[PDB]
Design a protein around this ligand. Structure first.
Ligand SMILES: *[C@@H]1O[C@H](CO)[C@@H](O)[C@H](O)[C@H]1NC(C)=O
Ligand SMILES: *[C@@H]1O[C@H](CO)[C@@H](O)[C@H](O)[C@H]1NC(C)=O
Ligand SMILES: [Fe+3]
Ligand SMILES: [Fe+3]
Length: 679
């Protein structure tokens, strides 16, 4: 009360040597109110994970594979610090796994069978665990032992660290399948030589491996990469043509106990002091007693892992999927029919219950799964637990930084050709009361505000984007006196006007009554000085059309819009008095389901779209009661997106800019973690 020493787990005799030498040296230049280091010794990395889980140790650095095993029940560890490997200014932490090949050898990923493979080694990420994991279900039966089936798949290979007596075929190119730099084709660089030399047809390596072996691009153009869509790309389009995105070397911590922040403090203070080129006393990435003790010797320092980043996310879908398949042999029995059912992500129980009903009517084509925030749902879509949800533009943006794709837009304009008509978008406006004559778009300092939610187009990204372009700081909660912006930090002023109780207060879901367009507006009625909503929200909640007590008798007449020019006009005059265009909300998913989601959803909306009336008794998809459940209440249909299937491409060039301009101000723990993976 308080303890500060980090109980670091060591493997070798040698590693335990440096661990205490590391402790001694920290004590020389770090004060007593800072972190120290203690050492625990166990027989292998396997024991260390067990150690940290049972709270008899705190941290250890691991390769991607062991990171997976560590996250598993009952270990439940999570990655907290990352080694990086480039310059301080463009630090490289992850590496993408790729399958390199000679230019114009006329085959794709789905034709690897019967070709000659070059690998880095067994247990290795890019050279084995990724390719074989992702090719697992095309391997011939029996797939036990894996090595045999792999041998039976390729027409000859080099598999390092494997066994040549049991399986000879893995060695035709490495006659002595040697787990050592002795054998010429070992590891990243050797595996590539294999391909370069002609031994093999495909080599499995990092994206950087080629660049480290061919400095000149005229040489690189003689190679290509195999993309997962059974197509080829040039070696410098790794980012859009890789297998999986491995992390290099990760310190992991207890998911509950920790000590997460401490671990960072120690390591950050370590790299400041004895890191790289730092001191000539102690060397954190070098040694006397053998190499890669505690950390890799090519490591240039550390970076903290954003707290939103659990292991599933860190390792990433394609990795996790890969390494899963290696252990649990689940493949379709025998073929996957055509389109299994879609997991829609309900936002807490209000949406769940609508979802659950939607499910019943769909005869097994739509399953429901809920999370309590949308970011949580987004992450669920990323990791496989979920498949699809519809999102405000500002959150499609985030989804898109997280590598998810817009599949179909919502459309709000009545038309005989609704499904095949891209709409320019809806209009973000700023609504106040006629009664409050005093207010103007300039005069807002020290007034009270109501937002749909943080990170949404009309409720945040647009209004605040502008505000930031004026005031020049992110502290919006000080420019306003107080407000309601569900998703704000519980003790900002922008949570003071929200209406939820007590944990639910300011929570960015329907349990909070000022959430969304209706909620933002209601906030304006009861508590605030200005709502930031879409252009239709007033009509939609006045003149009796919203029957709830608070809305029953409010009149359109009673409200006005603030225009940018400083003047103010009635609600219907939004075309002449809006803040910006807002990209229509849209549905998003991951690439491998874009197909089935587009198919199922048109199948689905023809049954339950705005065509249908007598919605009571029937199930009607796009009508909720004032709460935009699953979809906005005024959705007319879902529009196709031909070649407009990318968050940048979909949202357009204006919106992506404006949101980008706000990057500095972002508060979002998911955006941090996704752009950490990489922007
Ligand atoms: C709605 O449909 C009309 C019909 O021609 C079309 O011109 C327009 O793009 C759509 N949007 C608005 C705001 O009128
Ligand atoms: C409802 O409207 C759409 C619009 O053309 C139509 O395609 C669909 O078939 C209709 N509903 C049903 C249940 O078929
Ligand atoms: Fe590797
Ligand atoms: Fe919106």
């Amino acid at each position: 009360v308080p303890d500060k020493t980090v109980r670091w787990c060591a493997v070798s005799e040698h590693e335990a040597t440096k661990c205490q030498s590391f402790r001694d040296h920290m004590k020389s230049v770090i004060p007593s109110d800072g972190p120290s280091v203690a050492c625990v010794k166990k027989a292998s990395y396997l024991d260390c994970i067990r150690a940290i889980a049972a709270n008899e140790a705190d941290a250890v650095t691991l390769d991607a594979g062991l990171v997976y095993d560590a996250y598993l029940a009952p270990n439940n560890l999570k990655p907290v610090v990352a080694e990086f490997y480039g310059s301080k200014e463009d630090p490289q932490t992850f590496y993408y796994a790729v399958a390199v090949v000679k230019k114009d050898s006329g085959f794709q990923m789905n034709q690897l069978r019967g070709k000659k493979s070059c690998h880095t080694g067994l247990g290795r990420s890019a050279g084995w665990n990724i390719p074989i994991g992702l090719l697992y279900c095309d391997l011939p039966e029996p797939r036990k032992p894996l090595e045999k089936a792999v041998a039976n798949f390729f027409s000859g290979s080099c598999a390092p660290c494997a066994d040549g007596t049991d399986f000879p075929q893995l060695c035709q190119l490495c006659p002595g399948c040697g787990c050592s730099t002795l054998n010429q084709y070992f590891g990243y660089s050797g595996a590539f030589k294999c391909l370069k030399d002609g031994a093999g047809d495909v080599a499995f390596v990092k994206h950087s491996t080629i660049f480290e072996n061919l400095a000149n691009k005229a040489d690189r153009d003689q190679y290509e990469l195999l993309c997962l869509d059974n197509t080829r790309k040039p070696v410098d389009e790794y980012k859009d043509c890789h297998l999986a995105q491995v992390p290099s070397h990760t310190v992991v911590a207890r998911s509950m106990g920790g000590k997460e922040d401490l671990i960072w403090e120690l390591l950050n203070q370590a790299q400041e002091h004895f890191g790289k080129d730092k001191s000539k006393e102690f060397q954190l990435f070098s040694s006397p007693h053998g190499k890669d003790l505690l950390f890799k010797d090519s490591a240039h320092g550390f970076l903290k892992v954003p707290p939103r980043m659990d292991a599933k996310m860190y390792l990433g879908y394609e990795y996790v999927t890969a390494i899963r398949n290696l252990r649990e042999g689940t493949c379709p029995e025998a073929p996957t029919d055509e389109c299994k059912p879609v997991k829609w992500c309900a936002l807490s129980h209000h949406e769940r219950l609508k979802c659950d009903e939607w499910s019943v009517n769909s005869v097994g084509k739509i399953e429901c799964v809920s999370a309590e925030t949308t970011e949580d749902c987004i992450a669920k879509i990323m990791n496989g637990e979920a498949d699809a949800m519809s999102l405000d533009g500002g959150f499609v943006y985030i989804a898109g930084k997280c590598g998810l794709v817009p599949v179909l837009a919502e459309n709000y304009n009545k038309s005989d050709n609704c499904e095949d008509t891209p709409e320019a978008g809806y209009f973000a406006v700023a609504v106040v009361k006629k009664s409050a004559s005093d207010l103007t778009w300039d005069n807002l300092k020290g007034k009270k505000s109501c937002h749909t939610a943080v990170g949404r187009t009309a409720g945040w990204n647009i209004p605040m984007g502008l505000l930031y372009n004026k005031i020049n700081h992110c502290r919006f909660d000080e420019f306003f006196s107080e407000g309601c912006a569900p998703g704000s930090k519980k003790d900002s002023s922008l949570c003071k006007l929200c209406m939820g109780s007590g944990l639910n207060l300011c929570e960015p879901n329907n349990k909070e009554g000022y959430y969304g367009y209706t909620g933002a507006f209601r906030c304006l009625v009861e508590k605030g000085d200005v709502a930031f909503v879409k252009h239709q929200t007033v009509p939609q909640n006045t003149g009796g059309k919203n029957p709830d007590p608070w809305a029953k008798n409010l009149n359109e007449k009673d409200y006005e819009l603030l225009c940018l020019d400083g003047t103010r006009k009635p609600v219907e005059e939004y075309a002449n008095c809006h803040l910006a265009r807002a990209p229509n909300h849209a549905v998003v998913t991951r690439k491998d389901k874009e197909a089935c989601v587009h198919k199922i959803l048109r199948q689905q909306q023809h049954l339950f779209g705005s065509n249908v009336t007598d919605c009571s008794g029937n199930f009607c998809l796009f009508r909720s009661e004032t709460k935009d459940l699953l979809f906005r209440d005024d959705t007319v249909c879902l529009a196709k997106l031909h070649d407009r299937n990318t968050y940048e491409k979909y949202l357009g060039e204006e919106y992506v800019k404006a949101v980008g301009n706000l990057r500095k101000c972002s508060t979002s723990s998911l955006l941090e973690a996704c752009t950490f993976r990489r922007p």
